[PDB]
Amino acid sequence: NLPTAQEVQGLMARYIELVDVGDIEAIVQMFADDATVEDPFGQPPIHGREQIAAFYRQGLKVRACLTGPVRASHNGCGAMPFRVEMVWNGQPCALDVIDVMRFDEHGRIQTMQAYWSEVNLSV
Amino acid sequence: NLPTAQEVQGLMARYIELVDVGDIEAIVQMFADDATVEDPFGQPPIHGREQIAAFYRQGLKVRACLTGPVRASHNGCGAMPFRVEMVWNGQPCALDVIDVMRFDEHGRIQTMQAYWSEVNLSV
Numbered sequence: 251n252l253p254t255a256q257e258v259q260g261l262m263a264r265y266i267e268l269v270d271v272g273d274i275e276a277i278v279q280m281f282a283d284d285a286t287v288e289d290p291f292g293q294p295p296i297h298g299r300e301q302i303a304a305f306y307r308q309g310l311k312v313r314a315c316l317t318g319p320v321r322a323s324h325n326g327c328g329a330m331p332f333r334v335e336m337v338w339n340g341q342p343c344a345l346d347v348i349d350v351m352r353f354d355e356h357g358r359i360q361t362m363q364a365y366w367s368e369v370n371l372s373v
Numbered sequence: 374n375l376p377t378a379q380e381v382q383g384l385m386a387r388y389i390e391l392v393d394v395g396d397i398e399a400i401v402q403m404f405a406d407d408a409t410v411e412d413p414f415g416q417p418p419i420h421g422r423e424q425i426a427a428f429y430r431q432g433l434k435v436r437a438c439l440t441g442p443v444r445a446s447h448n449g450c451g452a453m454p455f456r457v458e459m460v461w462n463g464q465p466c467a468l469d470v471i472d473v474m475r476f477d478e479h480g481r482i483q484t485m486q487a488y489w490s491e492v493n494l495s496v
Binding site: 255256259290291292317318319321322323324325327328329330331346347348350365366367368369370 | 414447453470491
């Protein structure tokens with residue numbers, strides 16, 4: 251059902267778990283079949299699992315960690331702070347991101363927006 | 374003008390500065406005359422400076438601090454993690470919040486949403 255505030259915290263934490271390990275199939279499955287992702291926010295969205303699986307395969311030596319608690323509401327939404335660590339063209343770098351997600355009546359991510367730009371990159 | 378990613382970081386940081394000191398007049402002035410605030414997200418918005426000034430006077434012994442960097446985009450939006458510390462009915466408590474703001478072509482907060490619920494309160 252529509253996740254409660256406590257379920258939202260668990261779902262979003264799991265999401266970072268999946269990105270950290272790199273389980274692309276398990277990540278794609280958290281989304282609704284017709285979900286949209288705007289990463290980075292400001293850029294046009296990608297829609298549907300096919301486009302989302304391609305987005306994740308492209309992007310995913312990467313480790314992500316929640317850098318603070320997940321803020322959750324009572325209407326199936328949440329926002330969380332986290333850091334992603336990669337190694338860009340030999341040089342290892344970090345990106346601080348804030349993800350805002352809205353879940354549907356099935357506990358699946360219906361919409362996801364990631365806030366970050368080059369001001370949050372430490373190369 | 375529409376704040377750049379670096380201006381957004383500065384504006385949002387200033388916002389927390391103002392809340393921390395408790396300068397209600399300076400806070401209200403960062404908003405557009407017709408801005409809307411949804412705090413907590415999920416609750417219906419308050420519109421316009423009058424309603425916003427009343428909201429801030431009601432709420433503002435409170436100190437707020439950015440608990441992580443401000444994530445900013447290229448379209449005048451940003452999201453930031455912070456903690457508010459108060460003393461509720463004698464007992465001091467903390468609230469972890471994530472604010473997502475959208476600025477207008479004047480560098481004024483046009484829309485503001487705060488993510489938190491009782492799951493982020495430590496009384």
